[PDB]
Point group: C3
Chain length 235, copies 3
């Protein structure tokens, strides 16, 4: 179940401990068929240089049968919904996640957090919002889910950095959910058991979970304007 | 012999070249049953962010049968025996090694060094003093061995950064020795054949070498205040 | 063919993604018998600390039958041909590559770039000039190739960082060496020099002046430049 994991971090931050090759190896063993590396965007503390993201265009697409997406976990910078990902960085990347992390955007009033998150969602630049359920950052969950559904952004169901409320808001707003391990070692790759239970409780519809198959996720990215990746044709 | 290595460094410093996964693979190959990663403390040049240590809490305890300890090689900060390890770092770690490294504590007058080391030993915060037999830092030795025995701190017998003196001296003072490779690649993991023969030179008592077994070392840590690690119970 | 690759980068830069062990494993799989790690010199952005280079002296020489050279891709710093490699770094390293990279030396007038590159060559401190064919740094290719032959420096035949026929033909006539280098930033492209090869043959480049044909040829070149012989490689 869910042979896709979309959110993890490499030694590019010292607070992560696994490399691209560790992740490929763990994917192969666990039967994960498609994954994305999404290192923290460069404005954060302990994050890689922006070249880290631009040079991901060099990576192989398929290794040991495992498909590899080039991603970022960009940081929401302001209430205008700007993130620390440049045009050149976008050009090299397949997957844009964005979230709140305190060095870049300190938690503020509910209206502030909400406006920034919705402005990021409305920018058309991001595919997934990471850990929107984080109690550190209070938000209007319903207003966020409705914007995410309108602009076709997935909300993550997801340490160093509200399961039911988000899952139920997405359920009713009609949006996508993305499962992500936020792995900082390859050992938790693809492990998102903690929420699966809640999703079943709130009767979240299986059809709106991106992680169900490589093709469902790739189709979603293509619906968002991504050119088809020919190497993933047999996934 | 000595299936425990307690002092090694990962790519969290650019002057080291191996990852957690490299150390695991090597441990498996060399029959090492328990090991600790002890990356340089954050005040040192070319050392990781403090989050590198806090986030070690996420690591698996046992991989491929090998136990994994979360450590630091802290740098002695000042004559008050302070080290560059915060309380939040402590909370995340099992093993606290500390030692003199030039960028942080420029070697000074004997008395400065000693006030400093014997005071680190006396802080109760430290488990092992790394390469105390290093000529770049002169210290009252017989005396350091006597404080180490008094305070239950092991002295390492041990590039970029006297064996007999320490070995004979710890022998007579009644304290513990800890063997540590100070590996900066996984290739030298578990290799301390150099000082060892100087140990059989002073007829060092077999029962005061921590590395003889995982349980011996783990009981030592527990005696120093560490809660028992449930996953190592069968080690 | 070309069981030697001399130019590649590890996670010591975040714009690279592979470790020493990843390169070892790939060399074995690809039949590479000798390779060098040549991380970006410390003056560049996103480059390691200088200790990254000094401490390479601890590396094993041969792992699983593959020989490992300790290198640097140093940055040309100025028109005096200085590079960001210290005496203590030189003492730890086997192989010295140097090249232009934006943050350290900005592309300037053809004569500036030329003077800087030739002075580096003429320093005697360098074995190989990396991607001299880079269109971002206009040079007098003939004057460079002639300096390189005089001072026994190899020119590389060669995204982020990022004339191939013009370099090879200049080296051909000047009578110098060429070195092949993948400039890998993951181990997946290790030993991969397909692109320029057809053009080397197109210009009748003499194969006897390609360093990479065998480990011994490359090692003999380094010894010729003053490197004490590496005992552990005696059988390569
Ligand atoms: Zn993180
Ligand atoms: Zn995050
Ligand atoms: Zn994350
Ligand atoms: Zn070190
Ligand atoms: Zn040390
Ligand atoms: Zn150390
Ligand atoms: Zn590079
Ligand atoms: Zn270069
Ligand atoms: Zn390079």
């Amino acid at each position: 179940m869910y042979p896709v994991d979309l959110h993890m971090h490499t030694v590019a931050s010292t607070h992560a401990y696994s490399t691209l090759s560790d992740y490929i190896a763990q994917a192969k063993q666990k039967g994960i068929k498609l994954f994305a590396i999404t290192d923290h965007g460069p404005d954060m503390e302990d994050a890689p240089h922006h070249w880290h993201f631009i040079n991901m265009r060099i990576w192989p697409r398929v290794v040991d049968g495992v498909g590899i997406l080039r991603g970022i976990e960009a940081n929401i910078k302001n209430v205008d919904g700007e993130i620390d990902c440049s045009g050149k960085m976008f050009d090299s990347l397949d997957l844009i996640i964005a979230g709140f992390h305190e060095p870049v955007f300190a938690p503020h009033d509910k209206a502030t957090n909400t406006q920034a998150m919705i402005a990021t969602i409305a920018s058309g630049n991001v595919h997934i919002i990471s850990h929107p359920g984080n109690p550190k950052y209070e938000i209007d969950v319903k207003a966020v889910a409705e914007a995410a559904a309108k602009h076709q952004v997935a909300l993550e169901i997801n340490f160093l950095h509200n399961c039911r409320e988000v899952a139920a808001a997405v359920r009713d707003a009609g949006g996508w959910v993305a499962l992500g391990s936020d792995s900082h070692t390859a050992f938790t790759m693809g492990e998102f058991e903690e929420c699966l239970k809640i999703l079943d409780a709130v009767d979240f519809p299986p059809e709106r979970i991106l992680n169900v198959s490589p093709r469902r996720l790739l189709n979603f990215l293509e619906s968002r304007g991504m050119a088809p990746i020919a190497e993933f044709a047999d996934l």
